[PDB]
Amino acid sequence: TRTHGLFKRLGIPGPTPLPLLGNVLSYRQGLWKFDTECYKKYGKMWGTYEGQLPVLAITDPDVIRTVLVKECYSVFTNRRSLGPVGFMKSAISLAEDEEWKRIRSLLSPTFTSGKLKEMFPIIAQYGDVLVRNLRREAEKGKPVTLKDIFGAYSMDVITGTSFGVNIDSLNNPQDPFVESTKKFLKFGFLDPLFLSIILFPFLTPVFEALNVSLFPKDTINFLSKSVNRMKKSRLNDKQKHRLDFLQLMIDSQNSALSDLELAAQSIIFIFAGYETTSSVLSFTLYELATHPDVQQKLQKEIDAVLPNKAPPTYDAVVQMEYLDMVVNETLRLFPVAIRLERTCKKDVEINGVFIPKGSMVVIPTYALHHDPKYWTEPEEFRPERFSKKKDSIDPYIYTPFGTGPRNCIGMRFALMNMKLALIRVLQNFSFKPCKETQIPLKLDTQGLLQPEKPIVLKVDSR
């Protein structure tokens, strides 16, 4: 109740906060739904409270440009001050201020145009295994749980291109990396440990001293230990040397990246490479199965650019007009990060009102992606909205990978291996909804964008 008068003090609209909880009780419907309702109810700018933390939501593209680009280094340098996390504070998505600039600069050469071109044969090989394993479920005639097999593909791709190691997750029913990584998705806003940090932020140093973390400790330890084995095997074996993500961090120690810092960056990449890639792929295939005209029209383009099921090329992947439209439209309906989050490093006036230091500024990506002002009938899947040329698309309304220095470091990587998977499977298969298919697709109410029930489809040849 201490800060619960800040937004009325500035003449900013917003829902009335509950004394101890603020507006967190309104997250029960889903953080995406709360931002949508607030966007329609209030204007271009509304204020909420996560416990004591004041949260300013902005939708003016001119204002969004200021916080994400112009004043990114000036003020909005840090994303969000998370609770008790332990050594994971050095992870790039959690780092702050100059430490983040150092980590980001060191990791930036990971995804250049040349490095994307070199890892293409690695990704293409996993795609062959993907088509081979998906054929077995098709010839049997059983429904396919998309998040399983496409999750194994994503886990294989990220580990193979970042650490040069083939863990064979596509052919491992009990793959340890997937079992570990999917534990990051279980935590939600109404979890007792996390909810206590929201309501009582002063508990974060307490749990830190007690060595309690918001992250699953079994998962953190397995990945840290498993990554440390791949690093030691990289130094003893000079023949297995590739200029990749893991190597780039090993070269940092010649100057300087800690073993914990190296483990922190690896955990982010493994989680991002597995979860986001497989989630969006499962939405794309859901939208294709529920829109057969779009799927067959997408297959028509593939068979033309790659005649006779020809293996794709790097350039042929980035040439495809309709494929880029299908992926961009999936990311419009299902932006996996509901919002873009920035924290005021100092006191700043944003849109005229003065915002105190420590407050959070939020760009409601999901709400702006579903705005009827920018998208006619926003709940419908129409790849025709987009073209491969994005000259007309506002960079601050359509933000599936964020914008500015803090944008997604792996956007080009994520778009490549998703398109490669789609090309490979669509030139060999067609996806149909079945009895277990949930239509319409209901979104989950906790954390990242996830289906309420796992997406299952039937897969046939051709």
Instruction: Give binding residues for heme as ranges.
Output: 408
If binding is defined by CB under 6 A, does position 93 make contact with ligand RIT?
A: yes
Q: Please, which of residues 214-243 interact with ligand RIT by CB under 6 A?
A: 214-215
Strand arrangement of the beta sheet that strand 456-461 belongs to = 144-145, 456-461, 429-432
248 interacts with, out of ligand RIT, ligand HEM, none, CB within 5 to 8 A per kind: none
Taking the C-alpha atoms of residue 194 and residue 244, their distance in angstroms, rounded to an integer, is: 35
For 343, list phi and psi in degrees, rounded to 5.
-115, 135
378 interacts with, out of ligand HEM, ligand RIT, none, CB within 5 to 8 A per kind: none
CB-based contacts of 256, cutoff 8 Å, min separation 6? none
If binding is defined by CB under 6 A, does position 363 make contact with ligand RIT?
A: no
Q: Quick one: residue 30, left, alpha or beta (phi over 0 = left, psi -120 to 50 = alpha)?
A: left
If binding is defined by CB under 6 A, does position 194 make contact with ligand RIT?
A: yes
Closest CA to 160 of 128, 130, 133, 121: 121
The string of DSSP codes covering 149-172 is HHHHHHHHHHHHHHH------TT-
189 interacts with, out of ligand HEM, ligand RIT, none, CB within 5 to 8 A per kind: ligand RIT
Say if CB 411 and CB 401 are below 8 A apart: yes
DSSP letter for 66, please. Answer: I
Strand arrangement of the beta sheet that strand 360-363 belongs to = 45-50, 53-58, 360-363, 340-343
Residue range at the interface with ligand RIT (CB under 6 A); choices 130-138, 266-274, 301-309, 377-385: 266-274
The nearer residue to ligand HEM, 332 or 458, going by C-beta atoms, is: 332
Among 10, 145, 148, 189, which residue interacts with ligand RIT (rule: CB under 6 A)?
A: 189
Taking the C-alpha atoms of residue 191 and residue 325, their distance in angstroms, rounded to an integer, is: 37
334 interacts with, out of ligand HEM, ligand RIT, none, CB within 5 to 8 A per kind: none
Among 272, 280, 333, 355, which residue interacts with ligand RIT (rule: CB under 6 A)?
A: 272
DSSP letter for 335, please. Answer: -
Residue range at the interface with ligand RIT (CB under 6 A); choices 114-122, 263-271, 291-299, 392-400: 263-271
- Identity of the residue numbered 22: G
Residue range at the interface with ligand RIT (CB under 6 A); choices 58-66, 181-189, 222-230, 349-357: 181-189
Taking residues 197 to 216 in sequence order and writing x for each that binds ligand RIT by CB under 6 A, - otherwise, the string is -----------------xx-
Supply the minimum distance, in Å, between the C-beta of residue 8 and ligand RIT.
Answer: 25
Residue range at the interface with ligand RIT (CB under 6 A); choices 97-105, 184-192, 242-250, 358-366: 184-192
Closest CA to 400 of 283, 284, 287, 280: 280
Number of residues that bind ligand RIT (CB under 6 A): 18
CA 67 to chain CA mean position, Å? 20
Burial of 357 (0-12, 13-18, 19+ CB in 10 A): exposed
**Residues annotated in the binding site, as ranges?**
408
Q: Please, which of residues 395-414 interact with ligand RIT by CB under 6 A?
A: 408
Strands 456-461 and 144-145: antiparallel
Among 55, 94, 170, 246, which residue interacts with ligand RIT (rule: CB under 6 A)?
A: 94
Buried b (16+ CB within 10 A) or exposed e, 437-461: beeebebebbbbbbbeeebbbbbee
Among 271, 274, 398, 431, which residue interacts with ligand RIT (rule: CB under 6 A)?
A: 271
If binding is defined by CB under 6 A, does position 61 make contact with ligand RIT?
A: no
- Alpha helix stretches (DSSP H) within 210-313: 217-236, 245-250, 259-271, 277-290, 292-305
Supply the minimum distance, in Å, between the C-beta of residue 149 and ligand RIT.
Answer: 21
The nearer residue to ligand RIT, 50 or 301, going by C-beta atoms, is: 50
280 interacts with, out of ligand RIT, ligand HEM, none, CB within 5 to 8 A per kind: ligand HEM
The footprint of ligand HEM (CB under 6 A) covers 79, 92-93, 104, 268-269, 272-273, 276-277, 280, 331, 336-337, 340, 400-402, 404, 406-410, 413-414
Supply the minimum distance, in Å, between the C-beta of residue 132 and ligand HEM.
Answer: 24
Q: Coil, strand, or helix at residue 315?
A: helix
Taking residues 120 to 159 in sequence order and writing x for each that binds ligand RIT by CB under 6 A, - otherwise, the string is ----------------------------------------
CA 177 to chain CA mean position, Å? 18
Query: CA 174, 119, 129: angle at the middle one, nearest 5?
Result: 40
Among 59, 161, 180, 276, which residue interacts with ligand RIT (rule: CB under 6 A)?
A: 276
Query: CA 129, 171, 425: angle at the middle one, nearest 5?
Result: 30
With CB atoms as reference, the residue minimizing the distance to ligand HEM is 402
The nearer residue to ligand RIT, 369 or 424, going by C-beta atoms, is: 369
Residues that bind ligand RIT (CB under 6 A): 82, 93-94, 184, 187-189, 194, 214-215, 267-268, 271-272, 276, 337, 408, 447
